[PDB]
């Protein structure tokens, strides 16, 4: 379990070193964007969150493409990672599911949170919000899913 190295934690698997730098560059940046940069504007502070979620998202896409896509590590490396909280079991369990393959997050699928309905506009393919841009004519007024900053999260876009 614990991110911290400590004595309980089963020492590293083997090919670890070959990836270890790529990992650490994400890691420093988390320590970088937790650094309390003040701003008077709410639009910012929410952006600030959108970083940590972005990075987190990349690390998981990375370990993910290694293990499943190109199969560039061995199951015990991988499973040791996931045990250490390097990446989301869950999220990757979505990227295994059919359509989601590019999914943002675990909020952006939530049915139960949203007021009504479901599934932040984060999900909808551009090819439709473009359609309301056609008929109604306002172009398409969406930019950042309040949770993330997704744009065209659905795997077509």
């Amino acid at each position: 379990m614990p991110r911290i190295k400590t004595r309980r934690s089963k020492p590293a698997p083997d090919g670890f070193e070959k990836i270890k730098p790529t990992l650490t560059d994400f890691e420093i940046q988390l320590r970088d964007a937790q650094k309390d940069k003040s701003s008077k504007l709410a639009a910012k502070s929410n952006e600030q969150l959108w970083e940590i979620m972005q990075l987190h998202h990349q690390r998981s896409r990375y370990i993910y493409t290694l293990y499943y896509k190109r199969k560039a590590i061995s199951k015990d490396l991988y499973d040791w990672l996931i045990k250490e909280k390097y990446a989301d079991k869950l999220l990757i369990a979505k990227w295994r599911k059919t359509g989601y393959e590019k999914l943002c997050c675990l909020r952006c699928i939530q049915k139960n949170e949203t007021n009504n309905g479901s599934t932040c506009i984060c999900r909808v393919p551009r090819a439709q919000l473009e359609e309301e841009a056609r008929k109604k004519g306002t172009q398409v007024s969406f930019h950042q899913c309040v949770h993330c900053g997704c744009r065209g999260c659905a795997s077509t876009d």
Binding site: W50, Q54, K102, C104, R126, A127, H143, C148, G149, C150, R151, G152, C153, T156, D157
Partner: peptide
């Protein structure tokens, strides 16, 4: 719409997926 149309169409967004900005 068509698959080719979409595949070509997306690269338009600035930064891969999905945080890449349309426009």
């Amino acid at each position: 719409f068509t698959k080719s149309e979409l595949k070509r169409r997306r690269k338009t967004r600035k930064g891969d997926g999905p945080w890449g900005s349309w426009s």
